[PDB]
Design a binder for this molecule. Structure first.
Ligand code: CDL
Ligand code: CDL
Ligand code: PLX
Ligand code: PLX
Ligand code: PLX
Ligand code: PEE
Ligand code: PEE
Ligand code: PEE
Ligand code: PEE
Lengths: 459, 64, 175, 303, 121, 56, 104, 53, 57
């Protein structure tokens, strides 16, 4: 596993020793090479796992997330290249350092053979994200946003730590393999109920759950474009990975305890999809769409069936790519208009046709058009939930309809109609932005050719 | 600017806990959850009873 | 074709009728299929012959991996991790094999339904019964383990089912 | 061997070559519409052969050529059904599309984006061909959503017009209401019959229950604009006349009906769903004729 | 584990004599490398605070930082390893001297143990 | 021109050197987990006439 | 370029601040009417008539011809609900009650 | 990378599992054994607890 | 009205974050507001000493 970790660490001295006008080129080239190296982890087995050492192991749940994490960094650099032009070299290097530290923390988090190491890195991801949000954000609300994004997380994660050490005092180990092989049923007791809650809520706050989703619109709207991408694409999936890893020790208490969270997610996907219909903000709309999709992923994980796990894995990967692309498109609009309001810049298909094509493809893949992997995950989760209970289909159909409605609403409001007359500073799209959208969208349509690569360890 | 600010950032400072607001919030935020919980719990209880008695006819049901 | 076993995927003898032209009018199908043969089948066959001789010029082989049998989860001590690991791996391999068996039976059923045409309800009862039995066995083995399934959970389900069976048989005998 | 399969797949395959060439230089010239029209005509005259073979013999075929993912005991593969319905509908649709494009070369002569118009027409044709020849539920869903998205794009052809966008979103809304029942049927069949393939569904359902057939009926009502979800079909006349002539008159709108034709072995074993379908059809035809007899827009009358 | 009162413990000895019976940490120990990295970071921060070229201001000063950190880290690692060895030795001796408190559990195979099965539905 | 572009492009060797060093470290960590080599009940195998270890 | 005094504030109670709020939103004091002072966070925002954007004059030369809006005029609280792509309140040849009864 | 992922060797043992199933079903059809058994583990090696209730 | 403003912008905000902020602010104001008179601090220390002598034994 060190063949990926060491180059990521070496990205820092190279960035700090690079010439004042060659930081972006070096960082992009070497990040792309690191992603190419990380592609080798996709060769998994139907047997246990890829146990590299006592500290790091891989899995077909970990490998797609690792590949996405490595692939996201060059796109983040390419999108940050624009608005950091008037920045001093030291501060640009600091921004790249924050991105590299975030990538290293995520890489070490996703392997993490042990639960306390997983917790340490899972919280270590907080600091670079907080600094990025609160230092390179534009508005005055960023500070407030940062506070929310911090404390919510800790409010869920400090109990988890307690539970974790408690488990190591009883079981004797926190290794994932030993935990799986020596798992014992949880007696239906109040102590076990609160242990379940402590183990679960830390990851449910990061998805986020419908009741605990308030920090996400603030953090997404206020963060810079790279922060928004890393929040929507990878950081939301940490909670799903944690629940998938930790639900093994919670059986059979999950059957009773899952009802409140299942109700919250099944109604919150409808609520947030309806919220998306009446939104004056593009970033807020994309954030609420992310909330709805992760509510569906929460339902999938809670149902705890093989089809649920496969669909959840596919949906996390697909949503990461799609949400990052949508945020990039909105940022390209904002860098021209400087307002970030949907209704102001209109009729953009007439002025930027290729960007309109990118918008159409992104909206189609967010709308879960088959045979995209978005649709594969959606359909697998829906089938598993139907097997769970036949009345879920009503809520899922409502969610699908509202999702299509608000996706096409966002596309039509910005791309179609008549252009705003007084807005005259809309320059032709650059090669950088078009390449960014192409690099976002091509992996999705390539992955729809080989879905089993992102269907998880239960395939 | 005024429209967007009033729609987004001027709500809570102008919010006041009122019987109308409290009742509407409680209803619209709790009633759906408990209604759906009752529906799903009843459905799964009937399914569990039927499978316990064995009269459910789950032939060919292999994927879940 | 020798590429697959005829016993694993059985087929009827495929009796076909003889052409019986009741009129002197010449049908377009025979002429069309002859011109298709001349214009398509021959060049394809020649290209395949070239490719096959090129393959014959360079021949190499690959082998199907064989696995030894290992003590299963019933012959494992409560906390001996090595034997549990080996038994779990063996159980997962057997699970994959059973999945493939069900796949083969389903393929048989689908081929029957398409082949027998309008009389599939009667001419495919054997495949329906075969799939019913195989599906019943597979469902008894693995129906409700859920995610995080293991050999221990499968063994516990089997023990519960066989305890119920033993009690039912005892009550029926003692009825 | 047995040119039926080769010819049937070749028709659909050569239906896609102009889409591949859409990035080439011919797409930037005025010869592109004629190129697409000639491709469609050649596809029609090439697909006329399997129709003759079926007429002579009654030849039927299933071609499961490419193997997609396999989820435990469920196997998903790219599989085409070449039964009587497919080999009969393909030539008719190709002939109608050929006439439509020949008429379009004269109707849209002054449209700046005419090559894109013909590309859109060809993409809709490809999606409908995928829909008709599908042998499993997933491929049928792919075609189902492809024709819907293509109709959305073609209805809002003049995107500067507000009413065109309104009509396109209306069509999407009603078709998603139908997609709810489509997905319900797919989930029920996967859970109970353990397959999305048609052969296993037919074999394992001697007495099909109410729920999957009700889902199929809801999907068919959504896509064929029955009384519950009718207005989007007349509202879709905002698109150019060739679009209304090809998609919303004769090829796309029959799709829902075609769906119920695909599952007739299961529809014949249920009496309640048959009665519901009969009543829905009767009320739809009466109401729509009653609306028609008093309209002044000619396109609305024909819709 | 309060080993301050452990019998036969010289008060202010950093490393007792019996600690020499344990293998010393390798000079390429990862923890020693981390201590050297800490010294290097201290040197870089020292250059930064004093407003000097961070990477190439004082090579002698940075070398001294790294060397001192490595020295102290080596001795600290020796003490840590000795302390853990003492803990393990005491635990094993106590287990050996108290057989009645640590009985040998009877080996029981999973084929004869009845575990409750909870279906996932 | 050698010895001039080196002082500007020497940073490009850092990542590949890191990759090679990581591969070496992975092999070094591999070397310490050989307690069960050629001892699995699934791969108990008699050594070849010129084979010392089944895997390195 | 917008100052602090140009943003919506709390509900107006005195006629002087009512006139100030009317001045802020570019409307007459007589035409200004805030939402009722209930728990909802409307605050000091004009309650424009609930008429849709479809029934506005299509022959006037608006600054936003598709949206049928002018530059500095106040914006309805539910503007995105009435955008000619959504629910409209235009009068119909038949009364709403009559249509409802006939269809039912 | 796409070409590398496309041509990844079969470490999931799909073809291996298929061939194992083919040989097993060929064996069992020949001897007439009833395809797959309902019990994953043979009952003689399981020691049930006697109730005596 | 309900999903966006009533629940998301008001009540979900009122419950977790706003209540926490209000409670913590009130407690901070109460604790930190000492006039710097050692008389009050010494009286509190005497009260605490008496309470511990009467409670923890
Ligand atoms: C249909 C079969 C095609 C096969 C041939 C090979 C085609 C390869 C294309 C790969 C994908 C394209 C990459 C996306 C970015 C767009 C590229 C671009 O910049 O355009 C500039 C380029 C030059 O135009 P320009 O004049 O310079 O610019 C003018 C403006 O841009 C103005 O732009 P515009 O108005 O001209 O819009 C461009 C156009 C195209 O732009 C797009 O929107 C592309 C997005 C398509 C799908 C959207 C996401 C939905 C999820 C589907 C995922 C399936 C992928 C399969 C594998 C993909 C492999 C990478 O938009 C559309 O026409 C809408 C398409 C909606 C299709 C809905 C049907 C979905 C299912 C279709 C079947 C797929 C599986 C079938 C399986 C069963 C049968 C075997 O335009 C094109 O080249 C058009 C591309 C051709 C049309 C593709 C539409 C369907 C293809 C789907 C994927 C391939 C299917 C694989 C085999 C199927 C058999
Ligand atoms: C996870 C483990 C893996 C990674 C480990 C991470 C830690 C490692 C490093 C730890 C710290 C040691 C060095 C930091 C000293 C600070 C000096 C500095 O500022 O840098 C300037 C200096 C360049 O500037 P200059 O021309 O010398 O003069 C400009 C002035 O220095 C200053 O110019 P100015 O004053 O005009 O600019 C003002 C600027 C200057 O202010 C600063 O830059 C402050 C420096 C950062 C604070 C250090 C905190 C202490 C360490 C904590 C690390 C936390 C990590 C945990 C994750 C949470 C992240 C907070 O401040 C601002 O702009 C105000 C706002 C700042 C934004 C918010 C602040 C966030 C800072 C958090 C950074 C944490 C990571 C630091 C990474 C390294 C950064 C240099 O940077 C360097 O060149 C040194 C970098 C390292 C040298 C690499 C040499 C090795 C390559 C050759 C050998 C190859 C190795 C492999 C062998 C085999 C190959 C064949
Ligand atoms: C804010 C947005 C959402 C945030 C997250 C919300 C999700 C967390 C909700 C936790 C789920 C429920 C907690 C406990 C569930 C146990 C089942 C219980 O509710 O049912 C009955 C329990 O009866 C009563 O419920 C007893 C508890 C009553 C007191 C609890 C407070 C009820 C409302 C409080 C909700 C506030 C949550 C937020 C706190 C800040 C069953 O009766 P009984 O057979 O006897 O008990 C079985 C359990 N045994 C066997 C261990 C004894
Ligand atoms: C916070 C980071 C750690 C920094 C620590 C300071 C670093 C500079 C110190 C320089 C050398 C100090 C060592 C002293 C030399 C001889 C010490 C010896 O004589 O004392 C022995 C004791 O040795 C010292 O106590 C050990 C000092 C080592 C401290 C380092 C531990 C740090 C914790 C882990 C954080 C990692 C830090 C690594 C970077 C420095 C005998 O103690 P004893 O009379 O029998 O009992 C008294 C203590 N009791 C009561 C608790 C039992
Ligand atoms: C512009 C208009 C079009 C012009 C171009 C015309 C040509 C069109 C042809 C292109 C698409 C049409 C469909 C044709 C499909 C042929 C290719 C297909 O068959 O290959 C697939 C192979 O594709 C790959 O499997 C999928 C691509 C890999 C996806 C990885 C993404 C690349 C990494 C980049 C970073 C990732 C970021 C996201 C994180 C996860 C399926 O292979 P498979 O049936 O199985 O077996 C291969 C052979 N075996 C048996 C020897 C193994
Ligand atoms: C074109 C230029 C080249 C022309 C010369 C080549 C002519 C054909 C000879 C190629 C050799 C045959 C070949 O490609 O191998 C078969 C190979 C499959 O390999 P298998 O092992 O059988 O199954 C995969 C699992 N192991 O077939 C192919 O991949 C090529 C043809 C596949 C069909 C075309 C794909 C069209 C659909 C694209 C994907 C759409 C999304 C998925 C649809 C979901 C439907 C349920
Ligand atoms: C359950 C269905 C719930 C309906 C979802 C409501 C979604 C609201 C948001 C949609 C966006 C708003 C919008 O689209 O604008 C309204 C838009 C404009 O109206 P026009 O007449 O086209 O005006 C043009 C001339 N100026 O009209 C629409 O598209 C909205 C359509 C809503 C239809 C809702 C009614 C559906 C009821 C279906 C019941 C029947 C079920 C089928 C039974 C058959 C089963 C066998
Ligand atoms: C036992 C005690 C438990 C204590 C739990 C502490 C929770 C962490 C948050 C602490 C914040 C307390 C301070 C505070 O809110 O003051 C109000 C403060 C005043 O602003 P100032 O910048 O300080 O000054 C303005 C005047 N110029 O208002 C704010 O700005 C707050 C904005 C960020 C709010 C953070 C969100 C915290 C709530 C999320 C959930 C965490 C709650 C923890 C327990 C949850 C229950 C299980
Ligand atoms: C996003 C913000 C939400 C914050 C997360 C809140 C949920 C977490 C649950 C509250 C904290 C509990 C931590 C428990 C740590 C696990 C250890 C454990 O479970 O062991 C139990 C310990 O169980 C407890 O002690 C639980 C006491 C709880 C004290 C603090 C309560 C905090 C407030 C609880 C009310 C909220 C409940 C639902 C919260 C859901 C989130 C909103 C057994 O103790 P022993 O004595 O060792 O066993 C021997 C006897 N059988």
């Amino acid at each position: 596993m060190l063949k990926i970790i060491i180059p990521t660490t070496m990205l820092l001295p190279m960035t700090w020793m690079s010439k004042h006008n060659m930081i972006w080129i070096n960082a992009t080239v070497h990040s792309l090479l690191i992603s190419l190296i990380s592609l080798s982890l996709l060769n998994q087995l139907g047997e246990n796992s890829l146990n590299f050492s006592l500290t790091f192991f891989s899995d077909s749940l970990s490998a797609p997330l690792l590949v996405l994490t490595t692939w996201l960094l060059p796109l983040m650099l390419m999108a940050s290249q624009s608005h950091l032009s008037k920045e001093t070299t030291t501060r640009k290097k600091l921004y790249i350092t924050m991105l590299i530290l975030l990538q290293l923390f995520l890489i070490m988090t996703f392997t993490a053979t042990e639960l306390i190491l997983f917790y340490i890195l899972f919280e270590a991801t907080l600091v670079p994200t907080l600094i990025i949000i609160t230092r390179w954000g534009n508005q005055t609300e960023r500070l407030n946003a940062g506070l929310y994004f911090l404390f919510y997380t800790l409010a869920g994660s400090l109990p988890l730590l307690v539970a974790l050490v408690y488990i190591q005092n009883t079981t004797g180990s926190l290794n994932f393999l030993i935990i799986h092989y020596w798992s014992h049923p949880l007696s239906n007791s109040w102590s076990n109920i609160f242990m379940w809650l402590a183990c679960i809520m830390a990851f449910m706050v990061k998805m986020p759950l419908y009741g605990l989703h308030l920090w996400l619109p603030k953090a997404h709207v206020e963060a810079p474009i790279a922060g928004s991408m890393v929040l929507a694409a990878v950081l939301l999936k940490l909670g799903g990975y944690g629940m998938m890893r930790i639900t093994t020790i919670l059986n059979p208490l999950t059957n009773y305890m899952a009802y409140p969270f299942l109700m919250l997610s099944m109604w919150g996907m409808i609520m947030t999809s309806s919220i998306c219909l009446r939104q004056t903000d593009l970033k807020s709309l994309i954030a609420y769409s992310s909330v709805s999709h992760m509510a569906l992923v929460i339902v999938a994980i809670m149902i705890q069936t093989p089809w649920s796990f496969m669909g959840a894995t596919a949906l996390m990967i697909a949503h990461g790519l799609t949400s990052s692309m949508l945020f990039c498109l909105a940022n390209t609009n904002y860098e021209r208009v400087h307002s970030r309001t949907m209704i102001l810049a209109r009729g953009l298909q007439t002025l930027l046709p290729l960007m309109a094509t990118w918008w159409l493809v992104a909206s189609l893949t967010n709308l879960a058009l088959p045979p995209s992997i978005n649709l594969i995950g959606e359909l697998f989760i829906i089938t598993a939930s139907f097997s769970w209970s036949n009345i879920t289909i009503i809520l899922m159909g409502m969610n699908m309809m509202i999702t299509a409605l608000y996706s096409l609403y966002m596309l039509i409001t910005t791309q179609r109609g008549k252009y705003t007359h007084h807005i005259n500073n809309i320059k032709p799209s650059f090669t950088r932005e078009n390449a960014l959208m192409a690099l976002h969208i091509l992996p999705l349509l390539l992955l729809t050719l080989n879905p089993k690569m992102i269907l998880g360890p239960l395939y | 600017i005024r429209w967007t600010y009033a729609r987004s950032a001027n709500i809570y400072p102008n919010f006041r806990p009122t019987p109308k607001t409290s009742l509407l919030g409680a209803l619209f935020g709790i009633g759906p959850l408990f209604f759906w919980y009752y529906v799903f719990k009843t459905d799964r209880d009937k399914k569990e009873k039927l499978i316990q008695e064995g009269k459910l006819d789950q032939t060919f049901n292999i994927s879940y | 074709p020798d590429s697959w076993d005829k016993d694993v995927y059985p087929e009827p003898p495929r009796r076909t009728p003889a052409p019986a032209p009741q009129t002197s009018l010449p049908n377009p199908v025979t002429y069309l299929t002859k011109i298709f043969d001349l214009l398509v089948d021959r060049p394809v066959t020649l290209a395949r012959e070239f490719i096959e001789q090129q393959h014959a010029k360079n021949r190499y082989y690959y082998y199907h991996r064989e696995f030894r049998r290992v003590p299963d989860i019933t012959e494992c001590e409560e906390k001996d991790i090595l034997c549990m690991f080996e038994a779990e791996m063996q159980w997962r391999r057997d699970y994959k094999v059973d999945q493939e068996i069900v796949n083969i039976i389903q393929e048989r059923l689908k081929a029957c339904q398409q082949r027998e045409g309008e009389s599939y309800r009667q001419n495919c009862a054997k495949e329906l019964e075969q799939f019913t039995q195989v599906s019943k066995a597979f469902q008894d083995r693995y129906s409700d383990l859920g995610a995080h399934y293991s050999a221990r959970k499968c063994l516990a389900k089997q023990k519960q089912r066989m305890l119920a069976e033993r009690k039912a048989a005892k009550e029926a005998a003692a009825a | 061997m047995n040119p039926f399969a080769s010819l049937t797949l070749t028709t659909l395959t050569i239906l896609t070559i102009p889409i591949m060439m859409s990035n080439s230089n011919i797409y930037k010239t005025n010869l592109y519409p004629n190129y697409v029209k000639t491709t469609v005509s050649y596809a029609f005259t090439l697909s006329l052969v399997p129709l003759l073979m079926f007429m002579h013999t009654g030849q039927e075929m299933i071609i499961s050529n490419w193997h997609w993912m396999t989820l435990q005991t469920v196997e998903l593969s790219l599989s085409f059904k070449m039964d009587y319905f497919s080999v009969m509908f393909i030539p008719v649709a190709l002939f109608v599309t050929w006439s439509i494009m020949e008429f379009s070369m004269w109707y849209m002569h002054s449209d700046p984006f005419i090559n894109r118009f013909f590309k859109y027409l060809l993409l809709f044709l490809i999606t409908m061909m995928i829909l008709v020849t599908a042998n499993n539920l997933f491929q049928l869903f792919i075609g189902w959503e492809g024709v819907g998205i293509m109709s959305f794009l073609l209805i809002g052809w003049w995107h500067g017009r507000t009413d065109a966008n309104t009509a396109a979103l209306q069509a999407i809304l009603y078709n998603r209401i139908g997609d709810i029942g489509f997905v319900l049927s797919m989930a029920w069949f996967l859970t109970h019959s353990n397959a999305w393939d048609l052969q296993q569904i037919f074999m394992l359902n001697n007495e099909c229950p109410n729920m999957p057939l009700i889902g199929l009926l809801l999907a068919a009502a959504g896509k064929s604009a029955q009384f519950g979800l009718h207005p989007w079909l007349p509202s879709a006349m905002e698109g150019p006349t060739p679009v209304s002539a090809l998609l919303h008159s004769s090829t796309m709108v029959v799709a829902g009906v075609f769906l119920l034709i695909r599952f007739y072995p299961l529809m014949e074993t249920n009496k309640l769903v048959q009665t519901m379908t009969l009543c829905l059809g009767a009320i739809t035809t009466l109401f729509t004729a009653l609306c028609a007899i008093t309209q002044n827009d000619i396109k609305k009358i024909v819709a | 584990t309060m080993m301050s009162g452990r019998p036969g413990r010289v008060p202010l000895q950093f490393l007792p004599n019996e600690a020499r019976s344990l293998p010393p940490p390798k000079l390429t120990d990862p923890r020693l490398v981390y201590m050297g990295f800490l010294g290097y970071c201290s040197g870089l921060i020292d250059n930064a605070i004093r407003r000097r070229p961070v990477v190439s201001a004082g090579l002698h000063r940075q070398l001294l930082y790294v060397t001192s950190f490595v020295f102290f880290g080596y001795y600290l690692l020796k003490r840590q390893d000795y302390m853990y060895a003492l803990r393990d030795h005491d635990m094993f001796a106590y287990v050996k001297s108290h057989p009645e408190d640590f009985p040998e559990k009877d080996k029981k195979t999973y084929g004869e143990i009845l575990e409750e099965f909870h279906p996932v539905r | 021109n050698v010895l001039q572009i080196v002082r500007d492009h020497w940073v490009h060797i850092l990542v590949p050197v890191g990759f090679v060093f990581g591969c070496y470290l992975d092999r070094r960590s591999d070397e310490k987990l050989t307690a069960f080599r050629n001892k699995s009940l699934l791969f108990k195998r008699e050594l070849r006439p010129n084979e010392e270890v089944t895997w390195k | 370029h917008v100052t602090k005094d140009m943003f919506p504030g709390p509900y107006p109670k005195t006629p002087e601040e009512r006139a100030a709020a009317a001045k802020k939103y570019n409307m007459r004091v007589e035409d200004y009417e805030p939402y009722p002072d209930d728990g909802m966070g409307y605050g000091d925002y004009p309650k424009l008539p609930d008429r849709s954007q479809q029934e506005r004059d299509p022959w006037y030369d608006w600054d936003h011809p598709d949206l049928r809006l002018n530059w500095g005029e106040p914006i309805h609280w539910d503007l995105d609900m009435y955008i000619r792509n959504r629910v409209d309140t235009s009068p119909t040849p038949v009364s709403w009650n009559t249509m409802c009864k006939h269809l039912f | 990378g796409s070409t590398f992922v496309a041509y990844l060797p079969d470490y999931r043992m799909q073809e291996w599992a298929r061939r194992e199933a083919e040989r097993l079903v060929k064996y069992r059809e020949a001897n007439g054994l009833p395809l797959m058994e309902s019990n994953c583990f043979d009952p003689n090696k399981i020691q049930l607890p006697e109730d005596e209730d | 009205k309900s999903a966006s403003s009533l629940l998301d912008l008001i009540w979900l905000e009122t419950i977790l974050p706003k209540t926490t902020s209000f409670i913590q602010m009130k407690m901070s104001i109460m604790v930190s507001n000492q006039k710097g008179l050692i008389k009050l601090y010494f009286l509190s220390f005497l009260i605490t000493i008496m309470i511990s002598m009467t409670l923890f034994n």
